[PDB]
Structure 1
Amino acid sequence: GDQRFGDLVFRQLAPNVWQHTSYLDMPGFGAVASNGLIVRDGGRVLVVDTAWTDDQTAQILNWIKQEINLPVALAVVTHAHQDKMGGMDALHAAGIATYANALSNQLAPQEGMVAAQHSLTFAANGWVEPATAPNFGPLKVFYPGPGHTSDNITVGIDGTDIAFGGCLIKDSKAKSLGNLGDADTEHYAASARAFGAAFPKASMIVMSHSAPDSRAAITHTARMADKLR
């Protein structure tokens, strides 16, 4: 079940995988949840996405200390919006190595974000260039194409049935795609489908603004995105 820890929520998804959830009271939109991931890989911990704020992200690290008690080797953040990168300074203060799409790091200052320390680059087929993602262990990083944003990336967890779509994917009962302010409306559907095709064995889809779902999250998201064209 859910574990309330301060103002955040943690949920175990698999033996070595937990979802972190944090909230930002956005005026005119209510208190918006955003999810990321925590993965134990042997004697270290890997984080996918910050919380909305530095303080919340420090709380993620506090939860990790109390519930796992192993060092956080790295974090990867999945685009340059506040829900994914708002807590970068907290990661740096903690001495954690940070990674983002090169384009996310380029965009970070104008989006009001602090850039990650390291830039990921991607092959033409979307897979991360391995040299730019050293020591990522089971994290398999994939750029599906522009969709939710131009820079959005996705992460599969090798050895599990989990893939993380970030803010690209919404669940199978969602009425909308969420924040389309920086979206590529022409390419969104194809990018959602490319995410699915990159992680064909993933039966649990995790995403930023819905609870974990089946692969129907991918098909429904793509079908909704068809309407943008």
Structure 2
Amino acid sequence: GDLVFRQLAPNVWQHTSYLDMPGFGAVASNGLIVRDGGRVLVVDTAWTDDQTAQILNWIKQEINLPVALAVVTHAHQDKMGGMDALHAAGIATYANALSNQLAPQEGMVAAQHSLTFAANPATAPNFGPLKVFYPGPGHTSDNITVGIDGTDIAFGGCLIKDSKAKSLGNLGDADTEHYAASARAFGAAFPKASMIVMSHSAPDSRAAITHTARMADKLR
């Protein structure tokens, strides 16, 4: 139901937001709140439609300036989940073109403009100060990773994950046969992002990247 913020760089806030959906009890999910001059921008929305309202609320209350846009890492209820709020707050949603199709084909909303130049599996567009990067199929075929160039922040998302939870999390509608290839993608798509944020508890280091491909092969 709720929402937490861990300032983890100048310009940049982390979004936590807890529900008892996946990780047994209360689980975590992450987007980031990025600030682009006066503009304000977000990778990914919480679990629900009210958890992305409070992302917006604690933003005017403590960041201030107005949101323009919100990029969704993929067509999964943790990553879309909240959308309708973005729409109602005249926010431009930007799903990657393979997302806007697995959305209403797996119980959810499709983002406004569709992101591309990244449909075909080791690509990137640009974005103000932000970098959308596609790494192939992994956690879902449309999972999408982002770094803010000058913060050594990467966001692999539901793709890269914490050494904390034993295995790899929800791996439903996806491809294991590329995953381990695709965790690499970023390690070298942003060779520098020391601050790898991930969408289930605190940013580890550049070692989850590596361990995940190690891991996805422990269970393969």
Q: 1:132 to 1:180 in 2, by over 3 A?
A: closer
Deviates more, 1:26-35 or 1:207-216: 26-35
Shift of 1:124: 7.3
Is residue 75–residue 99 contact of structure 1 (8 Å, CA) maintained in 2? yes
- Residue identity over aligned pairs, in percent, reads 100
- TM-score between both structures, scaled by the size of structure 2: 0.93
Is 1:214 equivalent to 2:209 in the alignment? no
Q: 5+ residue gaps in structure 2?
A: none
Which of the two has greater helix per residue? 1
Is residue 171–residue 216 contact of structure 1 (8 Å, CA) maintained in 2? no
Shift of 1:131: 17
Which residue number corresponds to residue 119 of structure 2? Answer: 124
Cα offsets for 1:171-226 (capped at 9, x unmatched): 23441110011221110000000121101011010011131111011011111112
- TM-score between both structures, scaled by the size of structure 1: 0.89
Distance 1:206 1:222 in 2: 17
Is residue 19–residue 28 contact of structure 2 (8 Å, CA) maintained in 1? yes
Q: 1:121 to 1:138 in 2, by over 3 A?
A: same
Q: 1:63 to 1:134 in 2, by over 3 A?
A: farther
Cα offsets for 1:44-78 (capped at 9, x unmatched): 11100011111111110001111111010110000
Q: 5+ residue gaps in structure 1?
A: 1-5
Cα offsets for 1:12-51 (capped at 9, x unmatched): 0101100011112128822111011001111111100011
Aligned residues: 220
Q: 1:69 to 1:182 in 2, by over 3 A?
A: same
Q: 1:93 to 1:152 in 2, by over 3 A?
A: same
What SS does the aligned partner of 2:84 have? Answer: helix
CA RMSD, 1 decimal: 2.6
Distance 2:133 2:57 in 1: 29
Is residue 145–residue 156 contact of structure 2 (8 Å, CA) maintained in 1? yes
Is residue 121–residue 132 contact of structure 1 (8 Å, CA) maintained in 2? no
Q: 1:221 to 1:27 in 2, by over 3 A?
A: closer
Distance 1:27 1:185 in 2: 19
Q: 1:95 to 1:12 in 2, by over 3 A?
A: same
Is residue 130–residue 149 contact of structure 2 (8 Å, CA) maintained in 1? yes
- 1:12-31 alignment, distance < 5 Å: 12-26=7-21, 29-31=24-26
